[PDB]
């Protein structure tokens, strides 16, 4: 098997990930395509309609596929009222890293041995527009200059948790 | 599997037991991490048994499971059931000191397969990281951890007990 089932007395049989969704935790543990995006978006909207006050957690372990799908999730995170805490579990690469830093300021985390790859994916004018937009919001989320982001986005780039923290992509490393 | 209405691995999860009888990939890692977090939230005092029978896997997935083991409060006993290799062996040694177990006919492989061309420093970062953790878990000097992870020899449970990988061999 792979995905276990938890049961609770009421009578209720969740899958482990649905059990986390009960407590407002969304898993982003796979490459980002449009199916994944639609599911994540729906989960965010549902969670924001249960209790607009309490916050949400996005656990990330993705290689980050598609810019369209990731920006769909990004726009959903911006629009909803609840704050979206973010936690890098093992690998936040490409658009997964983007969603990592897109989380609420102060609520971006990574585990000691997590890794972050901000190299962004793959008309020419549309490509340049998307690149510029990603670099813009990344620079605002990290505080870094637009120029250093422009360079560290276009070429391949690895970062440990300490280095991501130094860079402004996360706000703390989970301890204890 | 062998199911009601809820299979065997779910009943195991109900008894605070996690089974790792497969290669460690992102799917397995997400699963194990979620189960550890869930068991920890359900009861932070009782311990958690992680039985391992794995040929290994990626560093990323393995370190996700490892970091989760370190974060949670419950003490995580680990048990080698037949084979713990690469990140499986690493996760074996990463269990609570005093509760790292192996069965008599087990085998432990220490070798962790290594992994732009100057991004190779990543490799150089990960390897020594692993080694430095292993050296701590085993009490072996770092200079021998560097030598034994480099080769693909296998250690029986007995010759992994004195190494510091496991603490006890469970017999009849």
């Amino acid at each position: 098997n792979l995905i276990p089932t938890v049961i609770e007395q009421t009578e209720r049989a969740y899958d482990i990930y649905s059990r986390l969704l009960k407590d407002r935790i969304i898993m982003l543990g796979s490459a980002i395509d449009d199916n994944v995006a639609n599911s994540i978006v729906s989960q965010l909207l549902f969670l924001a309609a249960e209790d607009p006050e309490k916050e949400i957690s996005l656990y990330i372990n993705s290689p980050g596929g598609s810019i369209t799908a990731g920006m769909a999730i990004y726009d959903t995170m911006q629009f909803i009222k609840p704050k979206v805490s973010t936690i890098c579990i093992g690998m936040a690469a490409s658009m997964g890293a983007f969603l990592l830093a897109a989380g609420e300021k102060g609520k971006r985390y990574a585990l000691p041995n997590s890794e972050v790859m901000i190299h962004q994916p793959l008309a020419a004018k549309r490509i340049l527009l998307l690149r510029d937009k990603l670099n813009k919001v990344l620079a605002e989320r990290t505080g870094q200059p637009l120029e250093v982001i422009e360079r560290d986005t276009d070429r391949d780039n690895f970062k440990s948790a300490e280095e991501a923290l130094e860079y402004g992509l996360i706000d703390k490393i989970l301890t204890h | 599997l062998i199911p009601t209405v809820y299979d065997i691995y779910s009943r195991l999860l109900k008894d605070r037991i996690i089974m790792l009888g497969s290669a460690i990939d992102d799917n397995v890692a997400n699963s194990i991490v979620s189960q550890l977090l869930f068991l920890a939230a359900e009861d932070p005092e009782k311990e958690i048994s992680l039985y391992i029978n794995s040929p290994g896997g990626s560093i990323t997935a393995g370190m996700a499971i490892y970091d989760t083991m370190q974060f949670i409060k419950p003490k995580v006993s680990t048990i080698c059931i037949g084979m713990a290799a690469s990140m499986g062996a690493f996760l074996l040694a990463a269990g609570e000191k005093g509760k790292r177990y192996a069965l008599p006919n087990s085998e432990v492989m220490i070798h962790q397969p290594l992994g732009i061309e100057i991004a190779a420093k990543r490799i150089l970062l990960l390897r020594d990281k692993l080694n430095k953790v292993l050296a701590e878990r085993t009490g072996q000097p770092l200079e021998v951890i560097e030598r034994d992870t480099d080769r693909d020899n296998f250690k029986s449970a007995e010759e992994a007990l004195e190494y510091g990988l496991i603490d006890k061999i469970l017999t009849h």
Binding site: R24, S85, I87 | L37, A41
Partner: peptide
């Protein structure tokens, strides 16, 4: 992953 998220 709490404390603190959640």
């Amino acid at each position: 992953f709490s404390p603190x998220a959640p």
